[PDB]
Amino acid sequence: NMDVIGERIKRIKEEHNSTWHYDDENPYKTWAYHGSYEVKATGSASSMINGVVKLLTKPWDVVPMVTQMAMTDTTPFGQQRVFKEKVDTRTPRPLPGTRKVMEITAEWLWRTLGRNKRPRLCTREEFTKKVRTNAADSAKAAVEDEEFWKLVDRERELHKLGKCGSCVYNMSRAIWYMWLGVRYLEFEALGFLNEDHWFSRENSYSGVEGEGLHKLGYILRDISKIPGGAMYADDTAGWDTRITEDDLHNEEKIIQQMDPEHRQLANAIFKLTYQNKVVKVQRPTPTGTVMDIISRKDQRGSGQVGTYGLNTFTNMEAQLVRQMEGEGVLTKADLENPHLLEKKITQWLETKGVERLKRMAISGDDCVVKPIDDRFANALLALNDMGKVRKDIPQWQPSKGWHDWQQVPFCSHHFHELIMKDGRKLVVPCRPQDELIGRARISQGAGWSLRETACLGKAYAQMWSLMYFHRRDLRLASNAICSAVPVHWVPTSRTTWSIHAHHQWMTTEDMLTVWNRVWIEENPWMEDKTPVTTWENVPYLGKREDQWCGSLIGLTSRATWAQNIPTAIQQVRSLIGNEEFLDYM
Ligand SMILES: COc1cc(C)c(C(=O)NS(C)(=O)=O)cc1-c1ccc(C#CCO)s1
Numbered sequence: 001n002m003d004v005i006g007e008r009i010k011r012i013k014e015e016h017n018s019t020w021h022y023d024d025e026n027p028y029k030t031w032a033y034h035g036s037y038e039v040k041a042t043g044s045a046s047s048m049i050n051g052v053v054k055l056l057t058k059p060w061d062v063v064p065m066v067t068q069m070a071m072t073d074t075t076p077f078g079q080q081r082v083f084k085e086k087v088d089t090r091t092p093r094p095l096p097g098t099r100k101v102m103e104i105t106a107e108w109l110w111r112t113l114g115r116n117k118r119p120r121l122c123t124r125e126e127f128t129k130k131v132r133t134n135a136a137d138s139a140k141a142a143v144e145d146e147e148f149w150k151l152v153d154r155e156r157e158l159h160k161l162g163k164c165g166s167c168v169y170n171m172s173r174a175i176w177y178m179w180l181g182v183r184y185l186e187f188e189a190l191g192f193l194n195e196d197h198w199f200s201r202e203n204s205y206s207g208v209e210g211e212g213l214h215k216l217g218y219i220l221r222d223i224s225k226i227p228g229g230a231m232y233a234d235d236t237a238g239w240d241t242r243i244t245e246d247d248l249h250n251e252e253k254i255i256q257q258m259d260p261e262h263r264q265l266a267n268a269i270f271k272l273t274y275q276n277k278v279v280k281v282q283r284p285t286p287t288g289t290v291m292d293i294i295s296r297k298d299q300r301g302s303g304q305v306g307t308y309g310l311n312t313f314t315n316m317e318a319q320l321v322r323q324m325e326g327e328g329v330l331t332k333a334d335l336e337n338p339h340l341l342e343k344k345i346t347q348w349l350e351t352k353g354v355e356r357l358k359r360m361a362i363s364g365d366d367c368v369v370k371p372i373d374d375r376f377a378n379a380l381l382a383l384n385d386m387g388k389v390r391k392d393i394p395q396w397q398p399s400k401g402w403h404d405w406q407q408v409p410f411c412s413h414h415f416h417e418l419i420m421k422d423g424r425k426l427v428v429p430c431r432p433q434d435e436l437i438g439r440a441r442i443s444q445g446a447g448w449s450l451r452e453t454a455c456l457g458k459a460y461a462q463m464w465s466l467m468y469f470h471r472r473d474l475r476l477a478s479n480a481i482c483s484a485v486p487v488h489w490v491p492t493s494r495t496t497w498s499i500h501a502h503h504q505w506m507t508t509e510d511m512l513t514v515w516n517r518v519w520i521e522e523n524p525w526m527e528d529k530t531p532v533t534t535w536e537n538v539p540y541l542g543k544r545e546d547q548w549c550g551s552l553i554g555l556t557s558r559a560t561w562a563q564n565i566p567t568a569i570q571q572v573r574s575l576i577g578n579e580e581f582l583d584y585m
């Protein structure tokens, strides 16, 4: 193993030869531990609170989920316990018949995914444009420095030789340049999966990449029209820790479709940074804080360019295998059999594969599957054996599916079908309201002025006006925030890092105009393009559904908040100062 990871550990060991030691009280059980060095502790035990959002959501000061969200421990202590609880495990090797079906399905799926698209290298200028559009950080400064690109070039020359010197995953500007450089090289070799939308629904059938939260419910409703059994949406317990050596070798098959110069760099990423990895994690000790240097051959590195796409790929494969078991194509005897008949798998993929992909909505580890019947509920042999054990349910207990697409969980949301006052139907995204309020009350970092805090508050308010307008409390709080924040101040930072977010709320354009563009003009499931001219015609969930999804409507404290909200708005305005404000109430 040292022939692939040895150089990286050697450079770390040499840079910290003063404090480098082999701490034999290290807690690693499934990861190879190489050594430790002294570091300055980073992170926080609590998240910073957005005062503008907090002042305008007084009834949620007394809400447990809202309080919990504001916690989140990122200190070496928090790092260590998350590591222990999840990441320090070993997934049993799938059986030989299971490995054979996975291999056949992976080959077929990669061929299907690359039927129209050809892989390509991503560039310095693409990465630069992405970093700049995200910053609008020291990454924009690094990208502007020529010396960063020279370090990138030197690392790439090692990769071309089948060597790695500085690509270390993290759980001086040199170590920052080496981190950003590692990320650029991964983007260079595997970025095409995202940049050329390989997991778009048109290209992958099951995929939803590029679709947007506002489209996911409509796609779930379209899946519900397909004849078959219930809709299943099982959660995997820590998916990234369940990515096996066999999954990694199956994902690597995409290199067969690459040009020689591309294949060489992508092979370097796979072999040196995915199938082998050097990881840095902080750990508190009685003497202070230390950085541990660890390594392993499997699992997925969560904060990587290829993670979403490769998790989507492996989940599509795993769900097709489960569909085959449900249909009787794969038996218990087949999974144990190294010599299992490849022909029946090939025949099922070639005749039914695409139709079975159309029965799914897959986004990374998130899946919704509508099998041909309910035999799928009990088809658990391959799923458990591939290592994709379902979260909080005994291993052999049948899955529970839904016969209403509106009850189906997907991507931390569920979706409602609303009837507008004019008779038109809308499909809207929704989640427990406490989660929406709790998240909006969290500020992103310390040393933030009232202006930056208010502008992030406005971003949350405008996201609610666009995606969660159907929640009575959120429309009211959104109107309150936008009345409290100067009209000409541009929303800043980001409300989410979700791939399903297109950030149409990041504007000073009228929110009703943005609402019409997204929900009416651009909406392919909205045949009638008649605009909505007033928010009074922008619908709400039925009051009982709003309440079932966490609304405080009907409570006295909520009525008291709604009545007194001009007072709280005025208090925010007075502390912001003499600026131009508008009355949205
Ligand atoms: C599936 O969508 C999401 C999934 C998750 C888990 C989270 C989240 O909680 N993010 S977080 C941890 O607060 O950063 C956020 C969203 C989105 C919010 C708004 C969106 C939009 C749009 C249309 O353009 S998409």
Ligand SMILES: [Zn+2]
Pocket (backbone or CB within 6 Å): 155, 159, 163, 164, 165, 166, 167, 182, 272
């Ligand atoms: Zn490297």
Ligand SMILES: [Zn+2]
Pocket (backbone or CB within 6 Å): 414, 416, 430, 431, 545, 549
């Ligand atoms: Zn709901």
